[PDB]
Amino acid sequence: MRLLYLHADRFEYKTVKPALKNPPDPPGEASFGEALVVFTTVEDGDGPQTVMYAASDIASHSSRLKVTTVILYPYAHLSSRLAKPMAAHKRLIELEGALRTKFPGHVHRAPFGWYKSFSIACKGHPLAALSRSFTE
Amino acid sequence: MRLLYLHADRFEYKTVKPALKNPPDPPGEASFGEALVVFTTVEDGDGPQTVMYAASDIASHSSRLKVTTVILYPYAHLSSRLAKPMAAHKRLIELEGALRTKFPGHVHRAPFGWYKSFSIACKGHPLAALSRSFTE
Numbered sequence: 001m002r003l004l005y006l007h008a009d010r011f012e013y014k015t016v017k018p019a020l021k022n023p024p025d026p027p028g029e030a031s032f033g034e035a036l037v038v039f040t041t042v043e044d045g046d047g048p049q050t051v052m053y054a055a056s057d058i059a060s061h062s063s064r065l066k067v068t069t070v071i072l073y074p075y076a077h078l079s080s081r082l083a084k085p086m087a088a089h090k091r092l093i094e095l096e097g098a099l100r101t102k103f104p105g106h107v108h109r110a111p112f113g114w115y116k117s118f119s120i121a122c123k124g125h126p127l128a129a130l131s132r133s134f135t136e
Numbered sequence: 137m138r139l140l141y142l143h144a145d146r147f148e149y150k151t152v153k154p155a156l157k158n159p160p161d162p163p164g165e166a167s168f169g170e171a172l173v174v175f176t177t178v179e180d181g182d183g184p185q186t187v188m189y190a191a192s193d194i195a196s197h198s199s200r201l202k203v204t205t206v207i208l209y210p211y212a213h214l215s216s217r218l219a220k221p222m223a224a225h226k227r228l229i230e231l232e233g234a235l236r237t238k239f240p241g242h243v244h245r246a247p248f249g250w251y252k253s254f255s256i257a258c259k260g261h262p263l264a265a266l267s268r269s270f271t272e
């Protein structure tokens with residue numbers, strides 16, 4: 001699993017065209033204020049332990065930043081060892097569930113399988129942009 | 137070298153605090169309209185051939201998108217095999233020079249060595265977000 005943690009003053013996205021033959025999530029859009037935006041690339045061989053490590057770390061970092069909103073944003077481009085789309089969607093659903101057991105704030109999982117537009121006002125402070133890897 | 141190509145309707149950044157003891161570039165800010173924003177992570181062992189491949193590819197993709205502006209945005213977080221900061225700055229300067237020999241539009245190299253805020257209105261079309269790797 002490869003993640004990019006962006007501490008945003010605002011974030012918003014909108015699904016555009018379907019990227020997969022049949023996106024497993026419906027289309028949509030959302031916007032937010034201060035949040036940790038987590039761009040999330042599921043890698044081959046991510047499993048239950050990977051998901052647990054990521055959930056704990058996301059919760060911890062959110063705690064450090066004193067953010068009370070986390071956006072889980074599926075992203076195919078953070079690495080070159082991607083899991084297949086169905087396994088990736090399953091892991092993202094697990095990640096959302098796991099995060100909710102560790103982080104008391106708002107958790108939004110953005111839709112999987114779409115091309116999406118977004119904008120972000122990414123803060124510029126020292127912890128506003130960090131990358132993470134998780135394995136098992 | 138690892139790159140993320142984002143086709144933006146707008147982009148803007150502002151240096152915040154210095155990330156390095158002595159950033160080799162002065163502080164600043166800029167904004168833009170439609171552009172290809174290239175987040176750029178220089179990796180260990182990038183050399184002259186890597187720079188040439190990246191310049192050619194950036195030019196080609198820009199040509200496909202019919203963009204006439206390219207932003208070279210130094211980014212430490214796209215991979216886990218970073219070059220050292222001085223070698224990375226040198227390669228980015230080379231990349232900017234090389235790109236100008238292949239791409240007829242505006243080339244902006246953002247400052248190196250700073251924490252930076254940014255916002256982007258990333259388009260949602262199928263080619264609006266792509267990743268690349270170059271080696272030699």
Ligand SMILES: C[C@@H](O)[C@H](N)C(=O)N[C@H]1[C@@H](O)[C@H](n2cnc3c(N)ncnc32)O[C@@H]1CO
Nearest residue numbers: 019041042074075076083088112113115116
């Ligand atoms: C493209 C850009 O605009 C958009 N934001 C996009 O990335 N869309 C992706 C993810 O939603 C998802 N996806 C497929 N595989 C993966 C994976 N292994 N990990 C995470 N997401 C995946 O399927 C879409 C196509 O790759």
Ligand SMILES: C[C@@H](O)[C@H](N)C(=O)N[C@H]1[C@@H](O)[C@H](n2cnc3c(N)ncnc32)O[C@@H]1CO
Nearest residue numbers: 155177178210211212219224248249251252
């Ligand atoms: C942090 C985030 O806000 C900001 N945007 C940032 O990334 N700042 C980076 C790059 O400008 C640069 N830098 C250092 N090494 C590299 C490298 N190998 N490749 C590219 N840039 C590098 O040095 C700064 C600290 O890593």
Ligand SMILES: [Cl-]
Nearest residue numbers: 057132133134
């Ligand atoms: Cl980690």
Ligand SMILES: [Cl-]
Nearest residue numbers: 193268269270
């Ligand atoms: Cl390539």
Ligand SMILES: [Mg+2]
Nearest residue numbers: 014015028029
């Ligand atoms: Mg819509």
Ligand SMILES: [Mg+2]
Nearest residue numbers: 150151164165
């Ligand atoms: Mg300033």
